[PDB]
Amino acid sequence: EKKEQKEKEKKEQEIKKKFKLTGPIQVIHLAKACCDVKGGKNELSFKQGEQIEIIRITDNPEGKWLGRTARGSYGYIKTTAVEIDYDSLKLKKDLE
Numbered sequence: 001e002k003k004e005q006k007e008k009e010k011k012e013q014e015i016k017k018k019f020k021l022t023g024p025i026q027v028i029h030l031a032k033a034c035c036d037v038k039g040g041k042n043e044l045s046f047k048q049g050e051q052i053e054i055i056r057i058t059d060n061p062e063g064k065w066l067g068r069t070a071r072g073s074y075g076y077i078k079t080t081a082v083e084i085d086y087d088s089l090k091l092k093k094d095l096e
Contacts, residue, residue: 030085
């Protein structure tokens, strides 16, 4: 099997208090890294087109969004550094 996991990684204690999540949810949308940043001023480290996931947009305290990287890193993106995929997959699903 793929036994490459020890935790789901909730060791991200700094992110929790930084953005204030309380109850973690699932990805809302997959954002595309609009640029390559290395996580300055407490941000997420990502490369242009890396693909990020947006989790918390609501009740953001600093104006920035909470984005996660595939490895589980929540860097609370400055919104300008990403572009979220609008819709979902099929937000409109008329059974098509």
